[PDB]
Amino acid sequence: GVRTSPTGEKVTHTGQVYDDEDYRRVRFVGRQKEVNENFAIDLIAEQPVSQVGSRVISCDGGGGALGHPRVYINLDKETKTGTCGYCGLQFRQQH
């Protein structure tokens, strides 16, 4: 989900791009700007929300020791989903 500025230079996920009057664009003349197009926010926004049947849940990122430290998420709010702090997965109580 990359976005291009009116000058033709792409914008990274951090929002960095060069202005039209910036002299630092000359480093890209005759070469190319290395920008990663797999924006992580869009890919984590497409994960389905996991419906569980407990007040609390545990997340480890999948894979056990190959993931993040095991955190515990509370699901007492019926308005918002409980998002894991590391992997960004969101869980939701079915009641």
Binding site: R55, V56, S58, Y72, I73, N74, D76, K77
Partner: peptide, 20 residues
């Protein structure tokens, strides 16, 4: 055993609250 979890509260735009 399993650790407890506390629901986070909102007290204003100055202090970020994580009550776990």
């Amino acid at each position: 055993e399993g650790k407890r979890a506390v629901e986070d509260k909102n007290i204003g735009p100055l202090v970020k609250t994580i009550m776990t």
